[PDB]
Design a protein around this ligand. Structure first.
Ligand SMILES: *[C@@H]1O[C@H](CO[C@@H]2O[C@@H](C)[C@@H](O)[C@@H](O)[C@@H]2O)[C@@H](O[C@@H]2O[C@H](CO)[C@@H](O[C@@H]3O[C@H](CO[C@H]4O[C@H](CO)[C@@H](O)[C@H](O)[C@@H]4O[C@@H]4O[C@H](CO)[C@@H](O)[C@H](O)[C@H]4NC(C)=O)[C@@H](O)[C@H](O[C@H]4O[C@H](CO)[C@@H](O)[C@H](O)[C@@H]4O)[C@@H]3O)[C@H](O)[C@H]2NC(C)=O)[C@H](O)[C@H]1NC(C)=O
Lengths: 182, 208
């Protein structure tokens, strides 16, 4: 049997990273848009072959075919890309009876579902956050929420937190939205 | 050969006394060349005879599927009784059994917070009203929205997700026309969970 895996979403969106398609057999011929390419790297039973893809090729829907000597074909999810709308929501006043409070990042209206969300403060990643998997909304687009938990003191003292979102339909494939007491 | 799957009642059914919770035992990969599929059901090891077993149904992969459904009492389920479905073939000694009960662990009461739309969303025709539900255990929960006495339909609720402290959280997002929000209408996020007093709480929000 043969299995073919796409690049990691982040690798396709950031030019500093190198996206790859992975062919796993549990000899290789690789094709991009039916044209044979010869730059894949094959590690010496499980056999793995890895093809580096160009960012623009992948995002532009080119098809990647792995032929083992059985054939598999993969490409980016199809459908009109839609820009994530990113909104930061402060903790409820009612949550202030607790020692920790919840900072919320709502990300909605995006397509495809491939996305990365992180929370930070002072340019450093926050340790305590969790993000819901994207979920289908009424209009066929996706939403999610990322919940950052912080000591209440850090919130009350006016510290600035930021929700970072990486998606293909954003300018520079990246946006940051701030959240602090105001 | 056969595979048996045993499903718990829906959380809304266990938490609302007027609803009827049930456990469902499903047998797949049944061959019609084998003897009749038989179900024996047990509550805390004691055999019960009130299950309703459906006729077998041919599937589109040269197999049959057979379902048996057992009504459960609300207090029995909530008190942690164990429900065993034992599947066998008439005249053969071998069997497959599955057991299910309410998730074990110290129950923890959900904290429920309502969050208005971001100022930045107010440039759209529709806005998002958020209900954060956190700190709960077990994950079994029901969340709904109402306004002016009536259910609000246009919401989506994320599945419970494990938080860093072993409890669960979710968010429910209600989409409303901005004019409805702007004119002062009160919206209510309703939550049903075993660890709440009366298995019920509601939190409201409106423009203020
Ligand atoms: C022959 O066909 C059988 C019937 O399938 C139907 O017909 C065929 C021809 C196809 O067209 C199918 O697409 C079609 O569905 C197959 O039966 C299936 O067998 C598999 C096991 O091989 C079962 O998988 C198990 O599914 C569990 C979840 O099941 C719920 O959710 C399903 C997916 O959404 C849904 O289809 C099911 O009906 C079921 O729905 C629940 O029903 C209960 C009771 O009625 C309700 O109260 C719930 O609300 C319903 N839930 C939802 C979400 O709607 C999984 O939990 C389970 O995973 C667990 O076990 C495995 C180990 O087995 C672990 O690895 C895993 O980690 C986890 O612990 C598992 O995936 C499937 O349910 C069966 N389908 C039906 C309809 O009964 C046969 O397999 C096939 N035979 C062969 C040889 O091919």
């Amino acid at each position: 049997s043969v299995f073919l895996f796409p690049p990691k979403p982040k690798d396709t969106l950031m030019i500093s990273r190198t996206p790859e398609v992975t062919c796993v057999v549990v000899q290789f011929n690789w094709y991009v848009d039916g044209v044979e390419v010869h730059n894949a790297k094959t590690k010496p039973f499980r056999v793995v072959s890895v093809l580096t893809v160009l960012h623009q090729d992948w995002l532009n829907g080119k098809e990647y075919k792995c032929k083992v000597s059985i054939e598999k074909t993969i490409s980016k999810t199809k459908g009109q890309p839609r820009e994530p709308q990113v909104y930061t929501l402060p903790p409820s006043r009612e949550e202030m009876t607790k020692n920790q409070v919840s900072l919320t990042c709502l990300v909605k209206g995006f397509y495809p579902s491939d996305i990365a969300v992180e929370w930070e403060s002072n340019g450093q990643p926050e340790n305590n956050y969790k993000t819901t998997p994207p979920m289908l909304d009424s209009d066929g687009s996706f939403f999610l929420y990322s919940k950052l938990t912080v000591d209440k003191s850090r919130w009350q003292q006016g510290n600035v937190f930021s929700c970072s979102v990486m998606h293909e339909a954003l300018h520079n494939h990246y946006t940051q939205k701030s959240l602090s007491l105001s």
